[model samples]
Target: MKKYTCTVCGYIYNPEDGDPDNGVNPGTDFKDIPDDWVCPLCGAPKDQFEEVEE
Candidate 1:
């Protein structure tokens, strides 16, 4: 799985470790996240996140 970073707050979204605080379960892919899901830390919209290179 790949990682995505929130441009607004630098919150890293790991597909293998989904955001449980936001109701996302483990093994959830970034594309599977709801369109309404925002950055848990900064509340930035999904559009504000960018794919991060390892």
Candidate 2:
């Protein structure tokens, strides 16, 4: 799965480790994340995130 990084806050979203704080389970891909889901660290919109090369 591809990883995404928040351009505004540098928050890393890893598909292998889903965001549990927001009720997201493991293996949730970036594309599968709800539109309402914001960055846990900075509350940035999902659109502010970009796919990371790593």
Candidate 3:
């Protein structure tokens, strides 16, 4: 699992921990997450995120 950052709001999505509030469970890959899934912090779309080193 890896971390992805929301380019718009700097929200970090850690796959290991997942975004439970957004219906994403642990171990879910960034690509597998639905495109309609908005960022839990800033409401950014999936395409607005960028993989980053945490």
Candidate 4:
């Protein structure tokens, strides 16, 4: 699974589960990040997100 993380707040987005604030929940696809969805901790845009190592 692809792992995404917020650089500003260290919030991780796991492909196995999505963040509810981003309008996504568990079983959501990794490529389905909402266009308006943002980081819940720092409010950063999707471009600010980065891949994280497991």
Q: Which is the leading candidate under lDDT?
A: 2
Top-scoring candidate (TM-score) = 2
Task: Give residue 19's error in model 2 in angstroms.
Answer: 0.3
User: Which runs of model 3 end up more than 4 angstroms from their true locations?
Assistant: none
lDDT of 1 at 16: 85
TM-score of each: 0.90, 0.92, 0.87, 0.73
- Per-residue lDDT tens digits of candidate 3, residues 1-54? 668999999998888888887789988899899889989988878999998964
Each model's lDDT: 0.92, 0.92, 0.87, 0.77
Root mean square deviation (Cα) for candidate 4:
2.1
lDDT per residue for candidate 1 within 1-54, as digits (tens), equals 779999999999998889988899989989899999999999999999999964
Q: Model 4: residues >4 Å from true position, as ranges?
A: none
Task: Give the higher-TM-score candidate: 2 or 4.
Answer: 2
Candidate achieving higher lDDT, 2 or 4: 2
Q: Point out the higher-scoring one by TM-score: 3 or 4.
A: 3
Q: Which stretches of candidate 2 lie over 4 Å from their true place?
A: none
Q: What local lDDT score does residue 24 receive in model 4, on the 0 to 100 scale? A: 81
lDDT of 1 at 54: 47
- Which pairs of residues have clashing backbones in candidate 2? none
